[PDB]
Scaffold this active site. Structure first.
Site, PDB file in Angstrom:
ATOM      1  N   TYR A 133      31.388  34.756  52.723  1.00 29.92           N
ATOM      2  CA  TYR A 133      31.809  36.043  51.777  1.00 29.92           C
ATOM      3  C   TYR A 133      31.576  37.370  52.623  1.00 29.92           C
ATOM      4  CZ  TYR A 133      33.345  39.242  48.199  1.00 29.92           C
ATOM      5  OH  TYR A 133      33.931  39.883  47.783  1.00 29.92           O
ATOM      6  N   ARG A 190      39.987  38.743  46.305  1.00 23.13           N
ATOM      7  CA  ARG A 190      40.616  37.889  45.586  1.00 23.13           C
ATOM      8  C   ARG A 190      41.725  38.047  47.230  1.00 23.13           C
ATOM      9  NH1 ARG A 190      43.963  41.994  40.683  1.00 23.13           N
ATOM     10  NH2 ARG A 190      42.859  41.264  39.656  1.00 23.13           N
ATOM     11  N   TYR A 195      27.979  39.983  40.294  1.00 25.15           N
ATOM     12  CA  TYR A 195      26.266  40.317  40.134  1.00 25.15           C
ATOM     13  C   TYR A 195      25.671  40.642  40.860  1.00 25.15           C
ATOM     14  CZ  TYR A 195      28.635  36.136  37.555  1.00 25.15           C
ATOM     15  OH  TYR A 195      28.992  35.367  36.444  1.00 25.15           O
ATOM     16  N   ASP A 209      38.567  46.960  47.119  1.00 23.58           N
ATOM     17  CA  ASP A 209      38.818  46.916  45.611  1.00 23.58           C
ATOM     18  C   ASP A 209      39.287  45.845  45.931  1.00 23.58           C
ATOM     19  OD1 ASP A 209      37.981  48.685  44.839  1.00 23.58           O
ATOM     20  OD2 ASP A 209      39.440  49.673  43.697  1.00 23.58           O
TER      21      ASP A 209
HETATM   22  O1  LIG Z   1      39.025  42.727  37.961  1.00 23.30           O
HETATM   23  C1  LIG Z   1      38.518  42.027  38.548  1.00 23.30           C
HETATM   24  O2  LIG Z   1      38.700  42.079  39.977  1.00 23.30           O
HETATM   25  C2  LIG Z   1      37.559  41.179  38.857  1.00 23.30           C
HETATM   26  C3  LIG Z   1      38.517  39.509  38.142  1.00 23.30           C
HETATM   27  C4  LIG Z   1      40.060  39.428  39.109  1.00 23.30           C
HETATM   28  O3  LIG Z   1      39.816  38.939  39.970  1.00 23.30           O
HETATM   29  O4  LIG Z   1      41.188  39.546  38.412  1.00 23.30           O
HETATM   30  C5  LIG Z   1      37.312  39.020  38.160  1.00 23.30           C
HETATM   31  C6  LIG Z   1      38.298  37.340  38.199  1.00 23.30           C
HETATM   32  O5  LIG Z   1      37.907  35.927  40.019  1.00 23.30           O
HETATM   33  O6  LIG Z   1      39.428  36.633  38.128  1.00 23.30           O
HETATM   34  C7  LIG Z   1      36.212  38.993  37.936  1.00 23.30           C
HETATM   35  C8  LIG Z   1      35.453  37.239  37.567  1.00 23.30           C
HETATM   36  O7  LIG Z   1      34.541  37.496  38.761  1.00 23.30           O
HETATM   37  O8  LIG Z   1      35.528  36.285  36.708  1.00 23.30           O
HETATM   38  C9  LIG Z   1      36.252  39.644  38.051  1.00 23.30           C
HETATM   39  C10 LIG Z   1      34.487  40.250  37.856  1.00 23.30           C
HETATM   40  O9  LIG Z   1      33.624  40.268  38.293  1.00 23.30           O
HETATM   41  O10 LIG Z   1      34.403  40.156  36.691  1.00 23.30           O
HETATM   42  C11 LIG Z   1      37.198  40.326  38.032  1.00 23.30           C
HETATM   43  C12 LIG Z   1      36.191  42.645  38.115  1.00 23.30           C
HETATM   44  O11 LIG Z   1      36.625  43.394  38.529  1.00 23.30           O
HETATM   45  O12 LIG Z   1      35.882  42.944  36.945  1.00 23.30           O
END
Ligand SMILES: O=C(O)c1c(C(=O)O)c(C(=O)O)c(C(=O)O)c(C(=O)O)c1C(=O)O
Ligand SMILES: O=C(O)c1c(C(=O)O)c(C(=O)O)c(C(=O)O)c(C(=O)O)c1C(=O)O
Ligand SMILES: O=C(O)c1c(C(=O)O)c(C(=O)O)c(C(=O)O)c(C(=O)O)c1C(=O)O
EC number: 2.5.1.153
Lengths: 293, 291
Positions: B48, B35, B87, B31
């Site tokens: 990636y 990040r 996605y 998970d």
């Molecule tokens: O919950 C997440 O971990 C998350 C995050 C995030 O790091 O907080 C992001 C992000 O880039 O901030 C995103 C995103 O792509 O915007 C997502 C996402 O997949 O929508 C998530 C997520 O796991 O939901």
């Protein structure tokens, strides 16, 4: 909306917020109550089952008054952590109280709580007079509280391992309908009514959750109190609700491609050293496990 | 035996200890790897999927080498937290890599890993062509690693909400056997093989667990790292293992009726002093657990 503000709100607006945003279904076992009893009561005079039952009322009352629609409360099983009773005879005294004590009956009435039981207790409760009586009392309590529509309380008795129950139920449903039961119907079959997935589980001590089959999801927020459940105060409850409602699902999501060098360094330091911290790793004092903080 | 001693052990010893005292089954989703990727790699120059894949290999190797028999790893579903891809085209790239990449096929081979997939992926996934292909690759991978007997790897793809699957499996089973299937049979049905209940789950960030239906228990020890999963060092793993093996089930149990007034006082005061693990704070849209 800040934490201090949320703690400063009157109970009614908190219950409104919770009715709008959840948690709608909350799991809350009462764990460590024998510990609590040996610290906060006088085992030489005080009656254990009555002390515990008074605290169960207090906490159920608190949860419902804060606008929580359904509470799921594991009561007895093979995998309950820090259970209320080592031996099933005492546990059966507790369950009987749950289904017969005047104080708690009054509570169910005053708060319009409909009370259901889940788990394999109809088979697995002692094939004894006492267990027969308890099963009877359960059925009767579900009936006598069935006009109550504001809250749902589900007590779990042997409420782990629903697999075989789901299998047998599904076989039956297919025999009686010509098609498999939907997910919704499986849930109704197990809990007696449809219940949505849990929005939070409040545990104690060792990080562990249990006894809420079909209702768990990655969206279920998990909490673990340092102190046994009956130490729960209204402030604690609010810190947990505030965290679930505003913090666990904060918007908008951060855009890391938008971050300065400083911003990435700052976030890197939080995650990077120091060091390899994991919540749920603990220490033992006098045979008792405590999470390291 | 103490934390420091355990940490000082030779890996082989740690592993024998794990082999006989557990965890035999460990759930470890990967998970927050986006990040991690934005923090530790260069998105303009680094691929990636390949970076993620390489870290996956590192951590899986680490777990199997520490004596753990079965690892369950949720890859993709609707209730994963901090998932690897927003996605499904990207997530299908990652999955495809898990079934087709040279480095990882080599990993399964060298560590004698049998790889299975669980969840409702056969229905959901192949709406498209890329998905259909991924599914065939999944099947091929289960078959081609099937003689490996040292370790088991279960990847979760839509591996939440098993209820409906269990129902249909049971209806079919009863129709062909004339009796309901046992728990064991149900578990074999869903995972492909019988798997013991999870002994531990290692999450990240927000305290939450997910995507190991039928295998969760009060005895499943839960852990949530502060840093995204791919930051894990051998020291973290050993702290986790030590806690689970020697602390979570400490014996003998304390006898409160045998404690002095002072002993009761010290314990009463730990509890009367009000903390909840799981309650957090937010910095820059990110949630962190409060210590
Ligand atoms: O919950 C997440 O971990 C998350 C995050 C995030 O790091 O907080 C992001 C992000 O880039 O901030 C995103 C995103 O792509 O915007 C997502 C996402 O997949 O929508 C998530 C997520 O796991 O939901
Ligand atoms: O055997 C017990 O019932 C028990 C338990 C237990 O839940 O299994 C616990 C426990 O909270 O884990 C404890 C305990 O407080 O540590 C005790 C105990 O009295 O030490 C017991 C027990 O009855 O011995
Ligand atoms: O369901 C959401 O909470 C959500 C929201 C939202 O705040 O309602 C947003 C949003 O702030 O617009 C987004 C978004 O990133 O646009 C998402 C999303 O990541 O898809 C969600 C969501 O996770 O459902």
């Amino acid at each position: 909306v800040s934490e201090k503000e949320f703690l400063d709100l009157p109970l009614v607006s908190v219950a409104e917020i919770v009715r709008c945003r959840g948690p709608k279904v909350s799991v809350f076992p009462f764990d460590g109550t024998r510990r609590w009893f040996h610290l906060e009561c006088n085992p030489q005079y005080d009656d254990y089952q009555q002390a515990a039952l008074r605290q169960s009322i207090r906490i159920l009352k608190m949860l419902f008054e804060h606008g929580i629609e359904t509470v799921i409360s594991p009561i007895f099983s093979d995998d309950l952590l820090d259970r209320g009773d080592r031996y099933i005879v005492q546990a059966l005294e507790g369950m009987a109280l749950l289904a017969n004590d005047e104080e708690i009956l009054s509570f169910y009435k005053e708060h319009e709580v409909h009370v259901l039981f889940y788990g394999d207790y109809k088979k697995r409760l002692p094939s004894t007079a006492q267990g027969a009586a308890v099963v009877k009392s359960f059925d009767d309590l579900t009936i006598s509280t069935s006009s109550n529509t504001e809250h749902r309380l589900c007590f779990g008795v042997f409420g782990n391992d629903a697999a075989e129950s789901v299998a047998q139920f599904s076989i039956s449903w297919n025999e009686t309908h010509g098609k498999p039961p939907t997910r919704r119907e499986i849930i109704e079959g197990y809990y007696g009514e449809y219940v949505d997935k849990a929005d939070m589980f409040i545990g104690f001590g060792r990080f562990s959750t249990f006894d809420f089959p079909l209702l768990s999801s990655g969206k279920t927020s998990l909490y673990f109190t340092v102190a046994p459940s009956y130490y729960m105060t209204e402030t604690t409850l609010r810190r947990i609700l505030y965290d679930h409602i505003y913090l666990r699902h904060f918007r908008p999501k951060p855009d890391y491609s938008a971050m300065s060098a400083d911003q990435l360094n700052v976030l890197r330091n939080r995650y990077r050293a120091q060091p390899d911290r994991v919540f749920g790793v603990g220490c033992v004092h006098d045979g008792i496990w405590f999470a390291e903080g």
